[PDB]
Please model this.
Amino acid sequence: MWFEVLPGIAVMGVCLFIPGMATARIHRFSNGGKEKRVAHYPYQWYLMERDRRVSGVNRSYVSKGLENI
Amino acid sequence: RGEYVVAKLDDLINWARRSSLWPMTFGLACCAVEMMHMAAPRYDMDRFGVVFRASPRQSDVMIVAGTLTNKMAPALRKVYDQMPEPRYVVSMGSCANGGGYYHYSYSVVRGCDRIVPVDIYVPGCPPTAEALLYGILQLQKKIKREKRLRIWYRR
Amino acid sequence: TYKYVNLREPSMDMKSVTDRAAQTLLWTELIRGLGMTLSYLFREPATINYPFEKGPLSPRFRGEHALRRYPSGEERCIACKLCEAVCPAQAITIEAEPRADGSRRTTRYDIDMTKCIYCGFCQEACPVDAIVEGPNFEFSTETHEELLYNKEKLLNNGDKWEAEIAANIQADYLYR
Amino acid sequence: NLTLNFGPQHPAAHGVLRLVMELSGEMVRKCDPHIGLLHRGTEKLIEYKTYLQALPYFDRLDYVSMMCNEQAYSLAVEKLLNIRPPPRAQWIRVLFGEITRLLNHIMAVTTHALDIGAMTPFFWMFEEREKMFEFYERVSGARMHAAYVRPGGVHQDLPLGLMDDIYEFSKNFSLRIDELEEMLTNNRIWRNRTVDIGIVTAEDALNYGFSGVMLRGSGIQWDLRKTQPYD
Amino acid sequence: MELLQVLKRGLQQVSGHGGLRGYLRVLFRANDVRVGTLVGEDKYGNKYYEDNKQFFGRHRWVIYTTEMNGKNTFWDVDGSMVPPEWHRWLHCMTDDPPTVKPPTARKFIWTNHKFNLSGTPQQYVPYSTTRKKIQEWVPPSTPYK
Amino acid sequence: MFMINILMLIIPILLAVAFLTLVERKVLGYMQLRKGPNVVGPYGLLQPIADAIKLFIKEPLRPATSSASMFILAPIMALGLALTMWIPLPMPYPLINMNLGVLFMLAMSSLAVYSILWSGWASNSKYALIGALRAVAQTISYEVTLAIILLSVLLMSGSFTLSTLITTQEQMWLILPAWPLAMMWFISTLAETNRAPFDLTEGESELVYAAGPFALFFMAEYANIIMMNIFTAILFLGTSHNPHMPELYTINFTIKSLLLTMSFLWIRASYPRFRYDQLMHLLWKNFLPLTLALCMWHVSLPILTSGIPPQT
Amino acid sequence: MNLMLALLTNFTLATLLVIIAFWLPQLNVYSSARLPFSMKFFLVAITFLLFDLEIALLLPLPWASQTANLNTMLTMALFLIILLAVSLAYEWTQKGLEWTE
Ligand SMILES: CCCCCCCCCCCCCCCCCC(=O)OC[C@H](COP(=O)(O)OCCN)OC(=O)CCCCCCCCCCCCCCCCC
Ligand SMILES: N=C(N)NC(=N)NCCc1ccc(I)c(Cl)c1
Ligand code: SF4
Ligand code: SF4
Ligand code: SF4
Model:
């Protein structure tokens, strides 16, 4: 019966689901729980390098707020 | 132990090879029609892992389904020689089994086992699609009994 | 009396011409063909679960041969050789002589099951219902020699299958 | 002129038919069928059989139209014997002759579609073929080579309840033809593979010895069931 | 919502086989978890079921025994294991099971059915059943030349 | 941590490819009034594993190769490129976030034709080579429309970044303003990947040569079928992205890809096969004229509607 | 460095799989130069190449639409596509798209 096709479909679904899920979670793990910063242009890259220096730990994802002022 | 290892490796490749038997059919004559009915929805050979249309380059079992004439014998042997191993042959129907109703003819090979080795003989003129399925399932059990690795280990 | 299968005039009014233009560009017949295959995906398949389910057969089915007996256990065959005469394939070979008790009985009764065409002419020709084609069709073998039946093999088939063979003959003999 | 002859300088086996074709690019310039690969000397073997013994050879000719082959041989022998089969036998023979026609046209149409890619009507219709094989098996004990139609009539009478099942099967079969037509008749890809392909004129068909649909396809009004009827 | 009543039918198959182990056992042996009426059981352990709501072909089936004639048939089942008295019923050559219309007993009928024996030590080996036809002359034992 | 990411992309791809074989055989079966695999494992779930093992312990084909190095190269080329096509795909976050991700995929897809060509040279057979050239001619022909169709859609997106297609389709799928292009794009992916009714390499292998691992070429081909359909979903059926619950995107986006892939299955079950010249005419005389006209239309349309997208 | 790693991994695994697909079966021990090929196929390849080159000039169009010189951009964008269409019209009428003969 047609619903016996579903188990194979479900296995494919889980297999395709992992790449998108693994990438999203690894990004959060590596970037202080936030999205990996996108730097497509020199301005975006420049602000990232500035952030790395301002962080004080050499990590561009460690934000520093008004506590530094 | 090494005995127990080869016992399970044998069980593994044997399970894989009989769960994925890909036939190429010489539909030479009548018996090809019953072979088509075994692929047809009622019996659905594909549900056993036996794909319907397989190229000779990827085939594991040859089914001689029909009369093998003298004029065709060289072509049958050619295809058999090109099948990669392991390869098995199922002889289907009286004609292929031993000439059948044209046994005494001048142009008919009296059994395909004169040209190629045969593993299973399916009797009938023609065997019912379910009779051919019985022979295919009997070939699987023949493969299940194989013990290449255990014999290699004991060389 | 006859009919035309493809003698039709396509209308050339703008409505009809636009109907074929929308068909060409929007693939309507192709999508209609997709509907038919979709309706089959949701139909119950016709597959049966062999070997746990079997295709239906009738009492007349022609399968593996067997030599039968009388209720007393005496062989029905009397070495008349009518089966051997009619066999279109010459698959039957018979020899006979007087038995120790004087009965007319066979000393050889072979069927080359790789010559046999399973035509059933032998059971039609037999005057005493001795040779029959039984209901068994699952006797494929691994060697050629296993399919060259002699009298011992054929009698064993009869003893093995008599329960079913008798019931099948009971069902069909009024049509013979 | 590339050539495909299935031999040295061409590693490939032929099969049932050895077609030796010479092509110019994509076009076929000559098509040379080499047959005899299923020649079995049936006509010589029949000379050693009695008329009844030779009957099963005709099941194994057009092995898709078994009972029709039996009928042609039976009519020839009845004509030479100067006898006729009884009316019920003639009606049974026409009934199974038309069932046999369904068996053949299903096979012809669906394998023709399969050979060019449309693989699915073959499965839907071969379930219908399987049911018709049961009618063969119920009257003769054999699914294909019934040997049921014999000179003088038929071998055995229909078992009780067979006609009812044939009625049930026929009642639904036209819807199966409709489903087959829904896949093929109006499909632009099917039409592009068959329209204006293998055109034969009415005169060429006659002089080349064609018959059946090969004649009627070109408009010739001929059918032996009408012009030279039998049974 | 028939979805729920479809699912309930699914669960009743689990209980219809006597728990999950029975449901799994028939799923992996016979690749089918349907529940049918028990029509009978032969002397070898094969169980025969019917379900007349199924389309013709699937309305009768056999769950083979796990051991026949000393052979382990838990996974290795075979169509030839069906004895003749049930063979007629399972192939729809009749309507009546042997539990209702048993076969005619005979002295010579096998009491123990055998499945296909090809490829085993029990396989059939052909031979000529006739005796020697030409007798040779045996020379005398005492010398005399 | 990035290497853990690469393997979490490669390994599931090969598994999804493996179980697409099972899904294809079962969906084709039920459309044909049968079941397909249901014995090898429950519901045939072990069938892909049995087939994989069997192929990999089969004897190699015995015709001698005309080029040893280039016999190895073809499968490596084919499989390596197939895996490479997945690294820029945003699901919703790409493994590699490429500014010109669309161009990268177009460029890599155009190199996958080399495996077809190289396997022809290594075949040591003129018929094998002639077959390889025919497939290449078909492949490159439909690359023409895919590139132009792709360019037309990007004129509503405004960049070559793939994740920008998600922003473009925030309010509405691109299949609505571009359904004429979606129709042609979908058929081109069928003919691009030698899929029925465009599987003529195996259609014309019929009647009336040294060959690499069938398994390696098969896996590459089926990875491309999934990737093509994933790309179709992103390009036309854009999924909304919630940055705080990314897994919601991955569920819906996956389902769209599965359905699109199942439609490839649905389509080989339904139609007969084109003749070679007729699918060449389908491109050069039908798709390409419309694609050129719609490329012109889609250059004009943003300008005349004042709907030009931003660069970033 | 990530793209190099991804590329290196993709082909190393492809290479690894290929070799074991070459040797794993060996764990068992199972016992003149002008191709006869139509000139029409050469023209397909050449036609693809020339259309591929024109497609290269159209690829910058998404960025080109960002200029204040939209009157010139649109004119040249259409000019190129029209000439691309004129080339197809020339091949078509000259029977270059045919396969007969
Ligand atoms: C307001 C201003 C607006 C301006 C813009 C207006 C544009 C809209 C109006 C135009 C519509 C454009 C349609 C674009 C689709 C392409 C249409 C097409 O090319 O069809 C013709 C082609 C050949 O047809 P043929 O019968 O051979 O006749 C001509 C041959 N000389 O036919 C074929 O393509 C052959 C069929 C091939 C497909 C067979 C297999 C698939 C069929 C089912 C697929 C279903 C579609 C899936 C959709 C995917 C969505 C992601
Ligand atoms: N289902 C198809 N696509 N047809 C087909 N070739 N079936 C055979 C199944 C198969 C082939 C290659 C691999 I690797 C795997 Cl794992 C399974
Ligand atoms: S064995 Fe019987 S059915 Fe098969 S080809 Fe020979 S005559 Fe025909
Ligand atoms: S069934 Fe026919 S061919 Fe077979 S032994 Fe009987 S008469 Fe001879
Ligand atoms: S089996 Fe019947 S027909 Fe044949 S020899 Fe014996 S009695 Fe005569």
Summary: Residues C 77-83, 94, 125-126, 128, 130-131 surround iron/sulfur cluster (ligand 5) (CB under 6 Å). Chains D and A do not touch (no CB pair under 8 Å).
